[PDB]
């Protein structure tokens, strides 16, 4: 099984390892033994479906600070922290018109997501690890 000897479109034999040609069949088998042929041979989804959704009543309180929202949540009995994220109003269930604002929504696993619309462009940061906290001893979330 020689991977270099092939048949051309003229009824001959071609060796692509040394780039040689052979007319008859006796010259292709005799071209493997030699110095040039030897030199050429030597050179070469689960967590989303199991999440319970009961949609309880959230308790969010906003306060205009100057240099902050506080959400009171029940005991979740788990290490999963509620995540906050800022999204646009273009994606909705009914797609209502004149929706060109942004909304910061906080979502948890045993509870529903609470969303607050922000008319301003950029007045704060919606990062989870920058200006957010979640006290598990009192079970209260703070977003600044």
């Amino acid at each position: 099984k020689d991977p270099y000897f092939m048949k051309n479109h003229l009824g001959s034999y071609e060796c692509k390892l040394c780039l040689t040609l052979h007319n008859n069949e006796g010259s292709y088998l005799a071209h493997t033994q030699g110095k040039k042929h030897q030199t050429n041979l030597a050179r070469r989804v689960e967590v989303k479906k199991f999440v319970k959704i009961g949609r309880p009543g959230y308790k969010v309180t906003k306060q205009r600070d100057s240099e902050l929202f506080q959400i009171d949540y029940p005991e979740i009995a788990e290490g999963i922290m509620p995540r906050h994220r800022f999204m646009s109003a273009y994606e909705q269930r009914i797609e209502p018109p004149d929706r060109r604002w942004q909304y910061l929504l906080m979502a948890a696993e045993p509870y529903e997501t609470i969303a607050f619309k922000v008319p301003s462009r950029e007045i704060d940061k919606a990062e989870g690890k920058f200006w957010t906290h979640w006290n598990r001893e009192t079970k209260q979330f703070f977003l600044q």
Binding site: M6, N8, H9, E14, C15, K16, L19, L21
Partner: protein, 208 residues
């Protein structure tokens, strides 16, 4: 005696036709005048090689034959392939027995279909000009595009369905063209949604 390439380029009115090998010839001015003529043909590139234009496509794959539509519309190629498949399975005794009592009527497709294919169904091939010469890599250089237009392969690779509506048929980068403005490299370029009507210019670009 022999001038350099810079003097031959400055003396001749067309310095683009001057080469490095023409400076050491017997007549640089006559060669510069003959190479920069109107109906002149350049020299082939195989005159300075070392393979005589026949040792390049040694191991490269090549098709055996490219049959046209007029020769393939007569059914002679399938009959020839069937005869070659039937003749390759016969042994020496079957080839020696067919020489004394041969079997007539191998194909017998038609008699006037070939004349109608060569006279009425004749198609003109894709010819070329007399100045366009041939080279070794001329059969593989097929890369030799327009602003405002997109091909089917580029639209399939980028995922942009071309339609009559200007909602998704322009690419989503063109909104950046709504942010910064028109490109300075093409002042006469017209894009739909910014400086062209959306139902009128359905080609997603026009060079006016």
């Amino acid at each position: 005696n022999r001038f350099t390439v810079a003097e031959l380029k400055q003396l001749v009115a067309r310095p683009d036709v001057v080469e490095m090998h023409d400076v050491t010839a017997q007549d640089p001015k006559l060669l510069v005048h003959l190479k920069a003529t109107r109906n002149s043909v350049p020299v082939p590139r195989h005159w300075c090689f070392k393979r005589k234009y026949l040792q390049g496509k040694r191991g490269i794959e090549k098709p055996p034959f490219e049959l046209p539509d007029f020769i393939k519309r007569t059914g002679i190629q399938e009959m020839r392939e069937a005869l070659q498949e039937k003749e390759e399975q016969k042994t020496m005794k079957s080839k020696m027995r067919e020489k004394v009592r041969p079997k007539m009527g191998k194909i017998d497709i038609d008699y006037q279909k070939l004349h109608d294919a060569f006279f009425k169904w004749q198609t003109k091939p894709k010819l070329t000009i007399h100045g366009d010469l041939y080279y070794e890599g001329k059969e593989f250089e097929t890369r030799l595009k327009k602003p405002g237009d997109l091909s089917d392969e580029l639209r399939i690779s980028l995922g942009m369905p071309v339609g009559p509506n200007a909602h998704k048929v322009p690419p989503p980068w063109l909104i950046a063209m709504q942010r910064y403005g028109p490109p300075p490299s093409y002042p006469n370029l017209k894009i739909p949604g910014l400086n062209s009507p959306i139902p009128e210019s359905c080609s997603f670009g026009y060079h006016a």
